[PDB]
């Protein structure tokens, strides 16, 4: 989960460029939720 990715999707015949840099606006929030979920899973596993 990264905020920015680089894709070489390789479609020049449609757009005309080689590689693109893209921002994933929800990446930070998804990382926060992933950490929260793994903490909850750790508690669940300890109890189990």
């Amino acid at each position: 989960i990264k905020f920015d990715v680089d894709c070489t999707v390789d479609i020049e015949s449609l757009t005309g460029y080689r590689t693109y840099r893209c921002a994933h606006p929800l990446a930070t929030l998804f990382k926060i939720l992933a950490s929260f979920y793994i903490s909850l899973v750790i508690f669940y596993g300890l109890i189990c």
Binding site: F3, R21, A23, P25, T28, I32
Partner: protein, 195 residues
């Protein structure tokens, strides 16, 4: 075992926690739907000031400045409020939920848990205030970001405005008030355990 055992202050704290939860849910909904930052490049009868930026470039600038510049308290305020209010409700109802205490209420372990719950709530009030008071002023309706997006947008300095901040300024402040009253109805409880 749910209605007559609640004293006046417990019910009033429950009402305040419900109000705080409602405010947190409203803030989270606003953050989900109508939370965005509008940016412009800083340094380019009267005519316009065209900067020849396509819409996708403006969106990229908005997201870069939003993720990098804005302080995390402004971004993640409603989730913090929701977590704190949920923890308060959980620790208030824990005196009923716990099976060891639920069986007895329905040894002196029953009272130590209440003392610990009151201590935890007081500590929560103190630690909530510790950063809420010092970070409420952090939010600003305007902001200035210098982000390394040149050679992608051609600019380096941007003036942005965070639309929700104003309402958040009217929200967190009011939320802080609902903390203080709650704190009283918390501290009073602790006093009844010691006075």
């Amino acid at each position: 075992a749910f209605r007559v055992l609640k004293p006046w202050w417990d019910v009033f704290t429950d009402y305040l926690s419900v109000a705080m939860l409602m405010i947190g849910v409203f803030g989270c909904t606003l953050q989900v739907m109508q939370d965005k930052i509008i940016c412009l490049p800083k340094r380019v009868e009267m005519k316009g000031l065209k900067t020849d930026l396509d819409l996708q470039q403006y969106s990229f600038i908005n997201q870069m400045c939003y993720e990098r510049a804005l302080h995390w308290y402004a971004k993640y305020f409603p989730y913090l409020v929701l977590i704190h209010t949920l923890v308060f409700m959980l620790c208030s109802n824990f005196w009923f939920k716990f099976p060891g205490s639920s069986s007895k209420i329905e040894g002196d372990i029953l009272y130590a848990m209440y003392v610990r719950q009151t201590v935890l709530k007081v500590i929560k009030f103190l630690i909530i205030i510790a950063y809420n008071s010092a970070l409420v002023s952090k939010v600003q309706f305007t902001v200035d970001c210098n982000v390394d997006i040149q050679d992608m947008t051609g600019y380096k300095n941007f003036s942005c405005n965070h639309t929700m901040a104003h309402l958040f300024s009217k929200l967190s402040f009011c939320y802080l008030c609902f903390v203080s009253i709650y704190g009283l109805t918390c501290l009073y409880t602790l006093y009844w355990l010691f006075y």
